[PDB]
């Protein structure tokens, strides 16, 4: 009374993507597809000659979505469903992030801004680390300060793509006002495919 | 045929919410309707279907007791709320109608093949609070909206006169369930003194917009 689905592919474009859904007895049952584009919500998949890129395809134990001459617009998630008449349960998939791997690499471009004057007359303290137009969506970002790291206080975004179609991120690094000004500078050392940019800033 | 969910809900635990599914289109009593729901960046999940005809409903395994799925069948609308929410309740919830018709007499379930838009549900224990805005100094520049909800904050600059180099940033939630994100416009070196930048940052939910001024 599962389904089973891989968790991430990556398929170059123009290429063949192969998702699996994996049941048993299902070899009865159609199941059907799903594609969620992030945001919007999922649409049902709908199958020389009339070409065809997506070709629903079922075989007793694993149903296999076969996606031909992968393009820029298929890049989404995709589901499998059925309904386990034994049950009375309409079974999801768990879904598989189908990435395509067409853009190339970019160095992250990182802006980091010191607490500003009007946060330390309330006292408190919130540094900023920027990071934009990064691909593809590693950024291990570390807070080092007075050449010691500090963890304490440090939050960081989940990377999210943008409108340029490269993923940009942000991190925050809360720190009490006495701290701040005690210390002689601080660092956003992120890290990136194993290339790390660093920024620096001061209490002036 | 496009099915229309109500708007984005946002309750604090204890508060219901109701998220109504309005079919246009088709003979009401057609088809069935699902109610499948996705978590915060996570799968799909189902909880049920409700026939608008019969009016029955089948509830799924771990969504029965606290959902209850009504019907209207004159203003030819379906809902789905939830008396009693929780902190783990927030989710974006999604409607369905079963309009595919079965390629094999064997298997007869109709498949989903009308979607809603998704009312975003967002349901955690925090108050409404108003985002203060600090000015982030410098090229680039930069604003600070920290420690806010419920999202929203609609930030631009100069009442819409820069476009070119803004890029508002997503919020960071953070431990105290207040959100928090930065805006950032990198401007020409030469043009600071000869040019007045100001953050546009206005919150609707909090009746809060401030344009406050980034000066060195």
């Known amino acids: 009374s599962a389904l089973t689905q891989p968790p991430s592919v990556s398929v170059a474009p123009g290429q063949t993507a192969t998702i699996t859904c994996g049941g048993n007895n299902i070899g009865r049952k159609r199941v059907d597809w799903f594609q969620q584009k992030p945001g919007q919500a999922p649409v049902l998949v709908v199958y020389s000659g009339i070409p065809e890129r997506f070709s629903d395809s079922n075989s007793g134990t694993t149903a296999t979505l076969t996606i031909s001459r992968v393009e820029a617009g298929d890049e989404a998630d995709y589901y499998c469903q059925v309904w386990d008449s034994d049950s009375d349960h309409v079974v999801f998939g768990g879904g598989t992030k189908l990435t395509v791997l067409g853009q190339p690499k970019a160095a992250p471009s990182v802006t980091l801004f010191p607490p500003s004057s009007e946060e330390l007359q309330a006292n408190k303290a919130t540094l900023v680390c920027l990071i934009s137009d990064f691909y593809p969506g590693a950024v291990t970002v570390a807070w080092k300060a007075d050449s010691s790291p500090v963890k304490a206080g440090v939050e960081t975004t989940t990377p999210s793509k943008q409108s340029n179609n490269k993923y940009a991120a942000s991190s925050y690094l809360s720190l009490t006002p006495e701290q701040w000004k005690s210390h002689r500078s601080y660092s956003c050392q992120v890290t990136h495919e194993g290339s790390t940019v660093e920024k620096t800033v001061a209490p002036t | 045929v496009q099915l229309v969910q109500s708007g984005a809900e946002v309750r604090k635990p204890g508060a219901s919410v109701k998220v109504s599914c309005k079919a246009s289109?088709?003979?009401?009593?057609?088809?069935?309707i699902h109610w499948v729901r996705q978590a915060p960046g996570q799968g799909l999940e189902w909880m049920g279907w409700?026939?608008?005809?019969?009016?029955?409903?089948k509830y799924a395994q771990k969504f029965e007791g606290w959902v209850t799925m009504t019907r209207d069948t004159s203003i030819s609308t379906v809902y789905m709320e939830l008396s009693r929410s929780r902190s783990d309740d927030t989710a974006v919830y999604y409607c369905?109608?079963?309009?595919?018709?079965?390629?094999?007499?064997?298997?007869?379930?109709?498949?989903?093949?009308?979607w809603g838009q998704g009312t975003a549900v967002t349901v955690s224990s925090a108050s409404f609070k108003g985002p203060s805005v600090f000015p982030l100094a410098p090229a680039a520049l930069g604003c600070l909206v920290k420690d806010y909800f419920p999202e929203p904050v609609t930030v631009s600059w100069n009442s819409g006169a820069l476009t070119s180099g803004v890029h508002t940033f997503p919020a960071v939630l953070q431990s105290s369930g207040l959100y928090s994100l930065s805006s950032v416009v990198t401007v020409p070196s030469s043009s600071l003194g000869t040019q007045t930048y100001i953050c546009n940052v206005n919150h609707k939910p909090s009746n809060t917009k401030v344009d406050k001024k980034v000066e060195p």
């Open positions: 369905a109608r079963a309009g595919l018709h079965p390629t094999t007499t064997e298997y007869y379930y109709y498949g989903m093949d009308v």
């Open positions: 289109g088709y003979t009401f009593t057609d088809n069935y």
């Open positions: 409700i026939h608008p005809n019969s009016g029955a409903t």
